[PDB]
Design a protein around this motif. Structure first.
Motif, PDB file in Angstrom:
ATOM      1  N   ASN A 176     -63.754 -13.370 -42.642  1.00 47.48           N
ATOM      2  CA  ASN A 176     -62.662 -14.272 -42.506  1.00 47.48           C
ATOM      3  C   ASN A 176     -61.413 -12.983 -42.793  1.00 47.48           C
ATOM      4  OD1 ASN A 176     -64.161 -16.439 -42.545  1.00 47.48           O
ATOM      5  ND2 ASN A 176     -63.232 -17.397 -43.923  1.00 47.48           N
ATOM      6  N   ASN A 185     -58.521 -12.088 -39.985  1.00 52.36           N
ATOM      7  CA  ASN A 185     -57.084 -12.485 -40.338  1.00 52.36           C
ATOM      8  C   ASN A 185     -56.354 -11.201 -40.167  1.00 52.36           C
ATOM      9  OD1 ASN A 185     -58.106 -15.129 -40.893  1.00 52.36           O
ATOM     10  ND2 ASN A 185     -57.651 -14.856 -43.294  1.00 52.36           N
ATOM     11  N   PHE A 216     -53.119 -27.935 -46.040  1.00 53.20           N
ATOM     12  CA  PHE A 216     -53.364 -27.886 -44.907  1.00 53.20           C
ATOM     13  C   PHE A 216     -51.899 -28.181 -44.230  1.00 53.20           C
ATOM     14  CE2 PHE A 216     -53.805 -30.205 -40.858  1.00 53.20           C
ATOM     15  CZ  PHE A 216     -54.558 -29.241 -40.014  1.00 53.20           C
ATOM     16  N   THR A 217     -51.602 -27.561 -42.995  1.00 52.12           N
ATOM     17  CA  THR A 217     -50.499 -28.165 -42.129  1.00 52.12           C
ATOM     18  C   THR A 217     -50.571 -27.733 -40.737  1.00 52.12           C
ATOM     19  OG1 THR A 217     -48.039 -28.055 -41.397  1.00 52.12           O
ATOM     20  CG2 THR A 217     -48.944 -26.047 -42.559  1.00 52.12           C
ATOM     21  N   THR A 218     -50.357 -28.712 -39.832  1.00 52.65           N
ATOM     22  CA  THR A 218     -50.457 -28.542 -38.498  1.00 52.65           C
ATOM     23  C   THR A 218     -49.361 -27.711 -37.778  1.00 52.65           C
ATOM     24  OG1 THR A 218     -48.901 -30.552 -38.009  1.00 52.65           O
ATOM     25  CG2 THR A 218     -51.185 -30.867 -38.183  1.00 52.65           C
ATOM     26  N   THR A 268     -49.366 -24.676 -39.171  1.00 55.30           N
ATOM     27  CA  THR A 268     -50.515 -23.307 -39.012  1.00 55.30           C
ATOM     28  C   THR A 268     -50.848 -23.107 -37.485  1.00 55.30           C
ATOM     29  OG1 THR A 268     -51.024 -23.630 -41.174  1.00 55.30           O
ATOM     30  CG2 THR A 268     -52.406 -22.173 -39.816  1.00 55.30           C
ATOM     31  N   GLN A 269     -50.726 -21.915 -36.925  1.00 56.14           N
ATOM     32  CA  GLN A 269     -51.513 -21.790 -35.516  1.00 56.14           C
ATOM     33  C   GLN A 269     -52.744 -21.397 -35.687  1.00 56.14           C
ATOM     34  OE1 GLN A 269     -48.296 -19.335 -33.595  1.00 56.14           O
ATOM     35  NE2 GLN A 269     -49.424 -17.484 -34.024  1.00 56.14           N
ATOM     36  N   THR A 299     -56.574 -21.476 -35.779  1.00 55.13           N
ATOM     37  CA  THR A 299     -57.896 -22.234 -36.281  1.00 55.13           C
ATOM     38  C   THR A 299     -57.783 -22.236 -38.103  1.00 55.13           C
ATOM     39  OG1 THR A 299     -59.085 -20.400 -35.673  1.00 55.13           O
ATOM     40  CG2 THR A 299     -59.688 -22.533 -34.624  1.00 55.13           C
ATOM     41  N   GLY A 300     -56.727 -21.231 -38.216  1.00 53.72           N
ATOM     42  CA  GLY A 300     -56.444 -21.356 -39.623  1.00 53.72           C
ATOM     43  C   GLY A 300     -57.085 -20.137 -40.448  1.00 53.72           C
ATOM     44  N   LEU A 301     -56.553 -19.529 -41.674  1.00 56.51           N
ATOM     45  CA  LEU A 301     -56.952 -18.439 -42.304  1.00 56.51           C
ATOM     46  C   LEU A 301     -57.922 -18.564 -42.993  1.00 56.51           C
ATOM     47  CD1 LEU A 301     -53.459 -17.514 -43.809  1.00 56.51           C
ATOM     48  CD2 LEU A 301     -54.541 -16.575 -41.609  1.00 56.51           C
ATOM     49  N   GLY A 302     -58.503 -19.775 -43.174  1.00 65.09           N
ATOM     50  CA  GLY A 302     -59.892 -20.154 -43.895  1.00 65.09           C
ATOM     51  C   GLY A 302     -60.078 -19.629 -45.354  1.00 65.09           C
ATOM     52  N   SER A 359     -59.338 -21.224 -48.218  1.00 66.11           N
ATOM     53  CA  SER A 359     -59.570 -21.931 -49.408  1.00 66.11           C
ATOM     54  C   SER A 359     -61.062 -21.857 -49.380  1.00 66.11           C
ATOM     55  CB  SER A 359     -59.273 -23.514 -48.998  1.00 66.11           C
ATOM     56  OG  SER A 359     -60.035 -24.469 -49.972  1.00 66.11           O
TER      57      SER A 359
END
Length: 149
Positions: free
Chosen positions: A54, A58, A104-106, A108-109, A111-114, A116
């Motif tokens: 991850n 990133n 979490f928010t929509t 974010t572009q 698949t996410g930063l992972g 958490s």
């Protein structure tokens, strides 16, 4: 979990090799440094690997074409530190902490930063700490785990 004893620097190498083609394609300047080639830890090898995967994914995405990534690993007696730095824009101090939360928010572009799950693995599983700082022309993501559980 299954904790095994391994060379943490072996994980770093596997993850470089995983992204090597992409890093090369993107003309990214990659550097790895360690103050101890044999950086032995007892930890959940699979989960620490997941964290490094991850962080490198990133860093590639954030640095972009012609960027720079540096990973450093450090022997600190009873604990190790791994730092993954990329050239690129700073993370606003306000999202420095927020970024590791189960937020979490929509907005974010991708698949996410992972991050958490990264915090879950480092802190909740391994009893360690993960954080971010703004550095050089870049950003660093750092974790520390004890050498033994």
């Amino acid at each position: 979990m299954e904790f095994t004893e391994f060379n943490l620097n072996e994980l770093i190498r596997e993850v470089y090799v995983l992204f090597e083609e992409k890093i090369r394609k993107m003309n990214i300047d990659f550097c790895f440094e360690t103050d101890n080639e044999d950086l032995r830890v007892e930890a959940d090898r699979t989960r620490i690997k997941q964290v490094l995967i991850n962080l490198v994914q990133n860093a590639i995405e954030a640095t972009g074409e012609n960027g720079k990534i540096k990973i450093t690993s450090e022997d600190m007696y009873t604990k190790v530190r791994v730092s993954v730095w990329n050239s690129g824009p700073p993370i606003p101090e306000e999202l420095k902490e927020k970024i590791f939360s189960p937020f979490f928010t929509t907005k974010t572009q991708g698949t996410g930063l992972g991050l958490s799950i990264c915090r879950k693995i480092i802190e909740d599983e391994h009893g360690g700490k993960i954080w971010t700082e703004n550095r050089e022309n870049g950003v660093v993501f750092i974790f520390e785990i004890p050498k033994t559980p």
